[PDB]
From a paper:
Polyubiquitylated proteins in isolation can be direct targets of the proteasome, whereas those embedded into membranes or assembled into multisubunit complexes need to be extracted or segregated by the conserved AAA-family ATPase Cdc48 (yeast) or p97/VCP (metazoan) with the aid of its cofactor complex, Ufd1–Npl4 (UN), prior to the proteasomal degradation. The UN heterodimer is one of the best-characterized cofactors. Here, we present the crystal structures of yeast Npl4 (zf-Npl4-MPN-CTD) in complex with Lys48-linked diubiquitin (K48-Ub2) and with Ufd1 at 2.55 and 1.58 Å resolutions, respectively. The crystal structures reveal that the distal and proximal Ub (Ubdist and Ubprox, respectively) moieties of K48-Ub2 interact with the C-terminal helix and N-terminal loop (N loop) of Npl4 CTD, respectively, and that Ufd1 binds to the groove of Npl4 corresponding to the catalytic groove of JAMM.
The region containing residues 113–580 of Saccharomyces cerevisiae Npl4 (yNpl4113–580, with the prefix “y” indicating Saccharomyces cerevisiae proteins) specifically recognizes K48 chains in vitro. The triple E123A K124A E125A mutation was introduced to reduce excess surface conformational entropy. The yNpl4113–580 (E123A K124A E125A) protein yielded high-quality crystals, and its structure was determined at 1.72 Å resolution by the single-wavelength anomalous diffraction (SAD) method using the zinc edge. The yNpl4113–580 structure consists of three subdomains, zf-Npl4, MPN, and CTD, similarly to the previously reported structures of Npl4. The yNpl4 MPN subdomain consists of the MPN core and two insertions, Ins-1 (residues 287–317) and Ins-2 (residues 403–462), similarly to other MPN DUBs.
Residue numbers in the entry: 113 to 181, 190 to 580
Write the structure that this text describes.
Amino acid sequence: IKELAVDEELAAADGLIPRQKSKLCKHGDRGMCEYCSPLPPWDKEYHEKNKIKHISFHSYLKKLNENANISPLSEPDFRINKRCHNGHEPWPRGICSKCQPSAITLQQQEFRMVDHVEFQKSEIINEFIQAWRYTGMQRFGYMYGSYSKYDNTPLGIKAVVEAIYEPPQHDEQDGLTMDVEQVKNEMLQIDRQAQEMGLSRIGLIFTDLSDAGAGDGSVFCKRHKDSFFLSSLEVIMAARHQTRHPNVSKYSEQGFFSSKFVTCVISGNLEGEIDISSYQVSTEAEALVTADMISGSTFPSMAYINDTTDERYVPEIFYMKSNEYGITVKENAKPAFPVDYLLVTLTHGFPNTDTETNSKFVSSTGFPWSNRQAMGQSQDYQELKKYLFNVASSGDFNLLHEKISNFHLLLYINSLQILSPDEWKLLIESAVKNEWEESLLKLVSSAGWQTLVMILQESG
Ligand SMILES: [Zn+2]
Ligand SMILES: [Zn+2]
């Protein structure tokens, strides 16, 4: 199929980085030579100098293309061919040079598919965190939004988060669980509706928050260099999500390469403050997990390597173990290795207030988010009436716009199946269009809307 607009745009950018004249330059200020010519966007020293921890995907792709001047990209695959009949019976009855997996060497991935996670409004994050503040129990959510150019790294991409949807879940003081099938079925419906709003499911976010007992609002720092950043189970979760949300690329043999799906953790920083850390996992991680080669066990920082079975062939596995200077040495990754090596890190932030606001939803709060009944925040007629009824008859379109421009409000209204599909589209336009007044005028006049407001009137 086609690539995202952001990938098409960045393919058409050259990412050149002009340089000052060098000492060694034997020419004028406007001349050029090997010492002062523009750097390519993937230039390692530039990234090191500027403390950019990974090069961007398009810097990486342009680097591969230059060095190969065959699809430059290919998703790694560590699975044994269980149907090789090249002069033997297939695994586990036989093996040959064509089907036998060779030794795997793991290392920190030098590029990242997404460079930055931008939350459109701090209220989005703060209302998610409120689930934990209110209950003392952890929380999981899916992030909706889109991808755009990020100019603070060469050819960078940012995930732009517009909303968070929390799936049904069983939260506890020190973790949480989900019914995988239940969540999948629900997210299928939410994905479809979010798509009608111009949103994609672009990542996941979860808390690891524990009050530090100082009456400060301060929290413990659990995740740091001497413990772990993401646990092996979390890395496996992230890999599975990435593989299920593949990034389309015409430059890969398979038509896809890795994923733009991002993983965020809200937890204490070293100063005891609530902060966000953002990650993806490497394509090596994707392939390890697809081949069912790693598991979580005793120590959360370590990825445990699984055994060879009838279904799974596990070759020798090495990793490029780093010292404090960043110098690596090849070591045996078995029986377990630090899962750190499977991560890439992303920056995160919020738009500045005077940046041109292109936020999809005017309000992030005010109407209960989904799956918060146990928090005392139900989505009912009583709640919708309280939220919306008086404004809906005031003639105040500014306030009405503010009320309906709200992701969780929209999903709840659509679930009532009062509005027609045309009226539903009208309501979406009223919520997310820059010029929304004409749409809202149509909606308010529609039979479906009138029906809804009347239903609100009679309830209570
Ligand atoms: Zn020069
Ligand atoms: Zn074979």
